[PDB]
Amino acid sequence: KILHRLLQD
Amino acid sequence: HKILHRLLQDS
Amino acid sequence: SLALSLTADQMVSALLDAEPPILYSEYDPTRPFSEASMMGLLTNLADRELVHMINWAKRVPGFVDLTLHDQVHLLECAWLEILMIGLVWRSMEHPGKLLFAPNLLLDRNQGKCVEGMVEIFDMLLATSSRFRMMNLQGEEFVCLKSIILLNSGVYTFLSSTLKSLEEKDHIHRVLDKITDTLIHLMAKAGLTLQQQHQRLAQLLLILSHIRHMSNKGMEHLYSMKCKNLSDLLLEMLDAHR
Amino acid sequence: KNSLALSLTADQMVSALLDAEPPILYSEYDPTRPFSEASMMGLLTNLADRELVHMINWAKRVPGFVDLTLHDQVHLLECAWLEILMIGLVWRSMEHPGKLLFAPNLLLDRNQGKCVEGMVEIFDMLLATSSRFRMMNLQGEEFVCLKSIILLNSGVYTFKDHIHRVLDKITDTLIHLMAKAGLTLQQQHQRLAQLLLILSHIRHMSNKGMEHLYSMKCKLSDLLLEMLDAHRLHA
């Protein structure tokens, strides 16, 4: 899931 | 006149 | 309009005395509740509740002041929300269960009988558990329910006339009276100002969830109309299409 | 485990929410003034897809949002994203009665919305919300409180005590803003209710809007499709 990556950057 | 309209009207 | 001239107490008593009765379903515990009979029961029940709802709405302060066209519109928009908050309120004392009728008490394992319904069941359960935590009062519930009636379709009006906006203005004055009433109730229960504003906001935020549940429910209902409901409930679904 | 957000004052809350505001983005600078259904949906989708990246960073700066697990954060943004886009659009459009300011170079009205089937209705609802915000004289400090409420509120029951403590804090902030502006006690709680009731209509526009969006794709980047597919899973 892309949203997971974006909430960690 | 729909059903709801009549029931609202019944006096 | 007498609605704007009602004191807070008179508002509560008006709303309390207009409460519809809790109807029974024709559920036979011996009959195996298939998917077809499950929706049959829910549909027959809601259809009878609609008759009582229409006469309840006539007794909501300010409602009869609106044109007949507006009354129709408000009820077409809000009927499922109103059914659902009633369901959720009668279900407060039954954790993990939805009391559709005194003889129809259901947990989430039922309603998986009807595909796509267990998600809405879960949301109705969580709303009911939320009302339990807050210890919602009956006087507060009848306020909430009246707010749904007046609010859910107030921004979907045709409003082609400058005077059709004057109809929206009166609905807002009544909505403000009900807010006044809710606050009155909370101060009388001993809550502080900060607690009153906080509780008031918590109750109104739950209305956004009730709108969500109704929209998702309505979506499944006029999709089930395609699959193989009575005349009044047919015109009600058709309104959301 | 205590959250920093609960110790913030009201002014500290307001200033942190203002500071976190996303930027106002532009759409493509070749919007052929006569639009078709395909170029209408192109511009809107591209714009919404870029806004999402800024929304995710704004969400991380809403006080208390980072205290939730990654799962809870994902859930709230999945439930709320079109509500947040919409209240943002409606806020920008306040100074433009009768029009929707999607971008500073993309200002549309009713009959431009006719270019897409069913968008007319949602456009009319967005215009009613904006005009309602305008008549209410909604202030920027109130708008950012309202937008944070939508983020935390709109998935809280689909899961919780931390969220509700945070929601209470934003309520205290909203009342704090109204007292400072000179409203009486009654005007304070009447206005609070009016603002929170509008959120139910925003929920409704998002629901209607969502069901068109996941039928259009049925009949958009990967992030927008995963955000979209999060609602279609229940359709």
Domains annotated for chain D, with CATH where assigned, are: 1-235 (1.10.565.10)
Three-state SS sequence of chain C: CCHHHCCHHHHHHHHHHCCCCCCCCCCCCCCCCCHHHHHHHHHHHHHHHHHHHHHHHHCCCCHHHCCHHHHHHHHHHHHHHHHHHHHHHHCCCCCCCEEEECCEEECCCCCCCCCCHHHHHHHHHHHHHHHHHHCCCHHHHHHHHHHHHHHCCCCCCCCCCHHHHHHHHHHHHHHHHHHHHHHHHHHHCCCCHHHHHHHHHHHHHHHHHHHHHHHHHHHHHHHHCCCCCCHHHHHHHHHCC
Q: What are phi and psi of C105, to 5 degrees?
A: -115, 125
Beta carbons of B4 and C68 less than 8 Å apart: no
> Is C90 annotated to bind ligand?
yes
> Which token pair is C158?
């045709």
Give D207's contacts in chain C (Cβ within 8 Å): 211-212, 215-216
Contacts of C150 (CB under 8 A, 6+ apart): C60, C62, C63, C74, C171, C174, C175, C178
* Residue in C closest to D154 by C-alpha: C209
Sign, Cα dihedral of C129, C130, C135, C136: negative
Beta carbons of D189 and C209 less than 8 Å apart: no
Distance CA(D25)–CA(D44), nearest Å, equals 12
D109-116: long-range contacts, CB 8 A cutoff, minimum separation 24: D112/D35, D112/D40, D115/D35, D115/D36, D115/D37, D115/D40, D116/D37, D116/D40, D116/D41
Beta carbons of B8 and C71 less than 8 Å apart: yes
Q: What type of residue sits at position D60?
A: K
SS3 label, residue D167: helix
Residue C21: alpha-carbon gap to chain centroid: 14
Q: What type of residue sits at position A7?
A: L
Q: What type of residue sits at position C64?
A: V
> Which token pair is D159?
């899961």
User: Could you tell me the CA-to-CA distances from D234 to C115, C212, D155 in Å, in that order?
Assistant: 10, 12, 14
Q: Are strands D100-103 and C104-106 parallel, antiparallel or unpaired?
A: unpaired
Beta carbons of B8 and C72 less than 8 Å apart: yes
Give D56's contacts in chain A (Cβ within 8 Å): 3, 6-7
SS3 label, residue D100: strand
Beta carbons of C194 and D203 less than 8 Å apart: no
Give B9's contacts in chain C (Cβ within 8 Å): 68
> Which token pair is C3?
């609605």
SS3 label, residue D183: coil
Beta carbons of D222 and A8 less than 8 Å apart: no
Choose the mutation target among D65, D69, D70 for the interface with A, i.e. most A CBs under 10 Å: D70
Q: What type of residue sits at position D136?
A: M
For residues C201-225, one letter each, b for 16 or more C-beta atoms within 10 angstroms of the residue's C-beta and e for the rest, the string is bbbbbbbbbbbbbbbbbbbbbbebe
Angle value at C-alpha C24, between C19 and C29, nearest 5 degrees: 155
Contacts of D52 (CB under 8 A, 6+ apart): D81, D223, D224, D227
Give D228's contacts in chain A (Cβ within 8 Å): none
Distance CA(C87)–CA(D88), nearest Å, equals 34
Distance CA(D208)–CA(C147), nearest Å, equals 21
- Provide the Cα torsion C214, C220, C224, C229; round to 10°: -10
Instruction: With beta carbons less than 8 A apart as the criterion, state whether B11 and C55 touch.
Output: no
Distance CA(D227)–CA(D84), nearest Å, equals 13
Give D222's contacts in chain A (Cβ within 8 Å): 2
Instruction: With beta carbons less than 8 A apart as the criterion, state whether C153 and C74 touch.
Output: yes
SS3 label, residue B5: helix
Distance CA(C18)–CA(C75), nearest Å, equals 16
Distance CA(C179)–CA(C185), nearest Å, equals 10
Q: Please indicate whether chains C and D are in contact, defined as at least 3 beta carbon pairs under 8 Å.
A: yes
Beta carbons of D175 and C156 less than 8 Å apart: no
Contacts of D110 (CB under 8 A, 6+ apart): D98, D120, D123, D124, D127
Q: Please indicate whether chains D and B are in contact, defined as at least 3 beta carbon pairs under 8 Å.
A: no
Distance CA(C83)–CA(C149), nearest Å, equals 11
Distance CA(B5)–CA(C71), nearest Å, equals 8
- Does the CB of B9 have a partner CB in chain C at under 8 Å? yes
Distance CA(D156)–CA(D153), nearest Å, equals 5
Question: Which residues, listed in sequence order, are joined to residue D103 by a DSSP beta bridge?
Answer: D106
Beta carbons of C205 and D186 less than 8 Å apart: no
Distance CA(D196)–CA(D212), nearest Å, equals 25
Q: Smallest Cβ distance to C212: which of D168, D207, D235?
A: D207
SS3 label, residue D84: helix
Beta carbons of C58 and B5 less than 8 Å apart: no
Q: Subunits with at least 3 CB pairs below 8 A relative to chain C?
A: B, D
Q: What are the respective helix, strand and coil percentages of chain D, to the nearest 5? A: 70, 5, 25
- Does the CB of B6 have a partner CB in chain C at under 8 Å? no
Question: Which residues, listed in sequence order, are joined to residue C104 by a DSSP beta bridge?
Answer: C101
Q: With both helix axes pointing from N to C terminus, report the angle between D140-153 and D161-180 in degrees, rounded to the nearest 10.
A: 170
D47-50: long-range contacts, CB 8 A cutoff, minimum separation 24: D47/D102, D47/D103, D47/D106, D48/D85, D48/D224, D49/D220, D49/D221, D49/D223, D49/D224, D50/D25
Beta carbons of C54 and B9 less than 8 Å apart: no
The C-alpha of D29 sits at a distance from chain C's nearest C-alpha, in angstroms, of 33
- Does the CB of B4 have a partner CB in chain C at under 8 Å? yes
> Which token pair is D89?
């659009």
* Residue in C closest to B9 by C-alpha: C68
Q: What are phi and psi of C104, to 5 degrees?
A: -130, 95
Q: Smallest Cβ distance to A2: which of D59, D60, D222?
A: D222
Over its C-alpha atoms, chain D yields an Rg (Å, rounded) of 18
Question: Which residues, listed in sequence order, are joined to residue C123 by a DSSP beta bridge?
Answer: none
- Binding positions of D for 17beta-estradiol are 51, 92, 212
Contacts of C134 (CB under 8 A, 6+ apart): C199, C202, C203
Other residues' Cβ atoms within 10 Å of the Cβ of residue D137: 9
